[PDB]
Amino acid sequence: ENEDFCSACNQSGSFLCCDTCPKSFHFLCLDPPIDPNNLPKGDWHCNECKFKIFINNSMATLKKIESNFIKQNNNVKIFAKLLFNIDSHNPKQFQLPNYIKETFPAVKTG
Amino acid sequence: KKPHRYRPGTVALREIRRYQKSTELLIRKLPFQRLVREIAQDFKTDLRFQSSAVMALQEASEAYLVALFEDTNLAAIHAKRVTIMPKDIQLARRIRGE
Amino acid sequence: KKPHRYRPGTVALREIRRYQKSTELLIRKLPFQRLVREIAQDFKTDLRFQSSAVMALQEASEAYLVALFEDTNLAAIHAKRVTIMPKDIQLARRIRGE
Amino acid sequence: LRDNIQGITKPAIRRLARRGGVKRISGLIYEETRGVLKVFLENVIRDAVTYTEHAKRKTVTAMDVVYALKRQGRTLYGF
Amino acid sequence: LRDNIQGITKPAIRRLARRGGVKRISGLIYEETRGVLKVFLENVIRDAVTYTEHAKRKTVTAMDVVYALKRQGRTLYGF
Amino acid sequence: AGNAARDNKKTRIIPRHLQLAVRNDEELNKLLGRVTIAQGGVLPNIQSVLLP
Amino acid sequence: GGRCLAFHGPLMYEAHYQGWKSSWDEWVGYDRIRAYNEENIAMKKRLANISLQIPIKLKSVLVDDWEYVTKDKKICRLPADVTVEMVLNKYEHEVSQELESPGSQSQLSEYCAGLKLYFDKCLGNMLLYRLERLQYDELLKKSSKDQKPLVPIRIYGAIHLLRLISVLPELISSTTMDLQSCQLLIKQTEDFLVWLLMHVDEYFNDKDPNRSDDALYVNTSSQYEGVALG
DNA sequence: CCCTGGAGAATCCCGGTGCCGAGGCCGCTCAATTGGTCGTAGACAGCTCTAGCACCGCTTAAACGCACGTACGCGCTGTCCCCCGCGTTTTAACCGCCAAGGGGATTACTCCCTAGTCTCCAGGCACGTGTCAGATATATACATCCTGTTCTAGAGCGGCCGCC
DNA sequence: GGCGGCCGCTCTAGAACAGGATGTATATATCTGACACGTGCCTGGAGACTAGGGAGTAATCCCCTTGGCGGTTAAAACGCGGGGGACAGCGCGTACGTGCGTTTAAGCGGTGCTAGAGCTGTCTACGACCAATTGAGCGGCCTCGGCACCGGGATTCTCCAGGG
């Protein structure tokens, strides 16, 4: 399954798609920035593609790895949950939060 | 001072009775006529339609859409629902084979 | 001991996959054959039916009932249900115009 | 011939529902499916009855069943 | 001619559903039936286009509209 | 139908394959929508909400 | 024949266990008794035995950031004189030397390090509009040619930290977290916000880069537009 | 919270216009009506012969019925965000009216392949038969679902410690 | 000396993981039963011919739909107020999923026979076609009247406010 909407900045351009993922990305809207002149061969997979059908969810499934990750990474537990959720999230452009839109009624989303 | 403030549904039922007993066509001719030419221009250019040709096309389009709307209505009350939904229309097309 | 005790619904999809890929006739031939004769007895007392004539009637009725059951089934998910009801069948016949 | 509408047994109707993708089958659908099948059979066979009388035949052939099903938009392949 | 699917206005769809006995109409219904009407119009007019081109005519007549609707089991009376 | 015959490891055309070939094609499905095929069955498709 | 005949605890064995599958039976010959079907199968088996606030000047900073990025076509100046490490160090030393020392320095430095690595691992995953993605790309390749692992902490400005603070409620509500840790993070966030309040003049200086060398912002070029939004 | 009296606005019956579409009239003309004449499809009589109607044995997979329980149908509550009723200002719809020029409808000259045969012959159909893929069958083997055991957070509880 | 706060101990348990279970996917052995090749015709279309008639083309004509406007009152659309209902959620339950005991007829194979559809003659009225004729359907015009339109009035079913 492939899409032509590219749900990382809501724009259009050169697209790449994954086999088992229905989300499209540009060559720049990724955590590793890749050029088409030296694109990797074989299958391309997203970050949560690496988190769903690959390690931490197929073998050594996410039972309590957040807590032992907290124990391993010298007690950053007030931020370690966000560090864990970074890996289980696709890269995307910055979007303004909803509660910033209400305080300024003069600006509307394009 | 107090406005009438009709509750929703009663005027909707009243509009049902007023239009089911009516004869005249609800959709205006000019918006429907321009839609026919726009669709036909994607198939064959420089195509004209007669006044009675659009008139025959408009009457069949309303009756087909009304019959779909009746089937959409009884599908809603089958689902213990009052308001029709877009998924109800998709259900009606599949069952009808269209 | 303790039996396997399959959960309610697991065998349902197992029968769904089996009958959707195999073309055997689910209805037994003789009960459907004698039903045809008693229906045709009201129209003609001295009537006979060929072996292939009853054969042709059975598959047409089987496919019509399955197609009706298909329209009956997706009406349940439209009504937030998984169980078919007689009101779903009457919904299917009215929409189809039968 | 009497009591022949019960020839379509309870597992026979259930098997038809399984072919149609039905997951759960109600106990009141067996009487409803029998009535629908009887109504459908009362139209195809009666149409085939009129085809049989016009052909100067006293036995219903499979060819007339195809003609009866064709005029109602339910044409059958393989006869 | 562009953006002509918006010619079927929102209360025009509401008026059509009032003829159908619909109590309440969702806001997403209007966008759905416009595609349904476009699909239905894309079949009858295309069939009428073949009827018009077969007669070596440049204008689609009301006779060809009736025959286009008749072959799909939606025959129109009164032309 | 020949492509559908290779799907279930068959080298002989069976009316099950003919029904599968007709219904799989989008153009052929609505053309023979009012057509009944004997000994063909239906497509083996299950709804998303039916699966546990 | 019979109804109950087994050597072990019987279950109505007929010479077949009723209510059980066919391929579970045994047909060996031993001492079989009835005992009224083990006294009615042993008495029938022994009788079933989140809201965050941001000051309006800071919200103005984010919305004019958005204006400069998307409308005015201005991207952030990479060789800025102030980096986020300097901001966090000034934060930590200023709030350590302002108040007393009751033990707040431990979780203060803990929050500083956690925010440092969060900003390291969240620079290009929630933040960074498509316009500056190739900016980040050229940072990574200009560091890869130098055989040095590039960190965002040493080169990026605090405006992206403000962006992360703005989208912090979305990340917090999307994760399962403890209540006390969430309120502690909120309190530290508000403390950082009032610290940015009192140092608002010397940190975010409003300058036009059309006539000044340093304005914590540079302007988009034509090839930049063509490769970014093309 | 439910029952009942008074009034705002959409709706229904009615008096008067008249008008534009319907009812009846004038021919006549083109399709409907009258009589004969055959090729020809059809009703009728006798033969038959291959498939259906009726009954038998069994046997066995299909089906009726009872016990148990958990996915699901149905009853009840909130809510809020999705849709209706109405004020207001545009907005395009249709009758009013005008050219117009491609285009539907009608008439004639003429041209080719289809109406209708003769003959035959090479493709098409009925029959006979070697044959090659499907089904039965069973140990072996997939294959996912259900269930039993377990591994470490989450919350409650209790012991320890500092402060007033 | 008593009490709130903090951290360790222990019970609870969510849900991934491994093993048993039963119905199918495959691995041959072998039957088997139609599948397609070959043969022998034999019946239907192709080369070739006779004659002709309905459309392609040309011309006319008159007709009719598109473009293109002001106008104006009907209404689409925006927005405010608000209102009742789809859906999330929870709880009751009974009734249909699952499992098999037990009866019961579907079906395979076999027998006999007549109910009757092709098949072949036979003879017989019947409808397309050809002369001959002819009579009201219809284009169009004169007349005329049923209800759209315009208001007037009215009962009449509905909502808001007051009382028990």
Swiss-Prot record, chain A:
Domain of life: Eukaryota
Record's subcellular location: Nucleus
Zinc finger (PHD-type): 3-52
Assembly with partners or alone: Component of the RPD3C(S) complex composed of at least EAF3, RCO1, RPD3, SIN3, and UME1.
Additional remark text: Present with 486 molecules/cell in log phase SD medium.
Function: Catalytic component of the RPD3C(S) histone deacetylase complex responsible for the deacetylation of lysine residues on the N-terminal part of the core histones (H2A, H2B, H3 and H4). Histone deacetylation gives a tag for epigenetic repression and plays an important role in transcriptional regulation, cell cycle progression, DNA damage response, osmotic stress response and developmental events.
Record protein name field: Transcriptional regulatory protein RCO1
Gene from which this protein is expressed: RCO1
Parent-protein residues present: 258 to 367 of 684
From Swiss-Prot, chains D, E:
Processing and modification events after translation: Demethylation is performed by JMJD6.
Keywords: Acetylation, Chromosome, Citrullination, DNA-binding, Hydroxylation, Isopeptide bond, Methylation, Nucleosome core, Nucleus, Phosphoprotein, Ubl conjugation
Annotated positions of the N6-butyryllysine modification: K10, K23, K56, K58, K70
Modified sites of kind N6-succinyllysine: K10, K56, K70
Modified residues (N6-(2-hydroxyisobutyryl)lysine): K10, K23, K38, K56, K58, K70
Residues with N6-glutaryllysine modification: K10, K38, K56, K58, K70
Cross-link for Glycyl lysine isopeptide (Lys-Gly) (interchain with G-Cter in ubiquitin), residue positions: K70
UniProt GO molecular function: DNA binding; protein heterodimerization activity; structural constituent of chromatin
Chain positions found as Phosphoserine: S26
Covalent crosslink: Glycyl lysine isopeptide (Lys-Gly) (interchain with G-Cter in UFM1): K10
Localisation per UniProt entry: Nucleus; Chromosome
Annotated S-S bridges: none
Modified residues (N6-acetyllysine): K10, K38, K58, K70
GO aspect biological process, one term: nucleosome assembly
UniProt function note: Core component of nucleosome. Nucleosomes wrap and compact DNA into chromatin, limiting DNA accessibility to the cellular machineries which require DNA as a template. Histones thereby play a central role in transcription regulation, DNA repair, DNA replication and chromosomal stability. DNA accessibility is regulated via a complex set of post-translational modifications of histones, also called histone code, and nucleosome remodeling.
Assembly, per entry: The nucleosome is a histone octamer containing two molecules each of H2A, H2B, H3 and H4 assembled in one H3-H4 heterotetramer and two H2A-H2B heterodimers. The octamer wraps approximately 147 bp of DNA.
Protein name per Swiss-Prot or TrEMBL: Histone H4
Full protein: residues contained: 23 to 101 of 103
From Swiss-Prot, chain G:
GO cellular component, one term: nucleosome disassembly/reassembly complex
InterPro entries: Chromo-like_dom_sf, Chromo/chromo_shadow_dom, MRG, MRG_C_sf, MRG_dom, MSL3_chromo-like
GO molecular function ontology, one term from the record: histone reader activity
One biological process term in Gene Ontology: negative regulation of DNA-templated transcription
Keywords on record: Chromatin regulator, DNA damage, DNA repair, Nucleus, Phosphoprotein, Transcription, Transcription regulation
Family statement: Belongs to the MRG family.
Protein name as annotated: Chromatin modification-related protein EAF3
Origin species: Saccharomyces cerevisiae (strain ATCC 204508 / S288c)
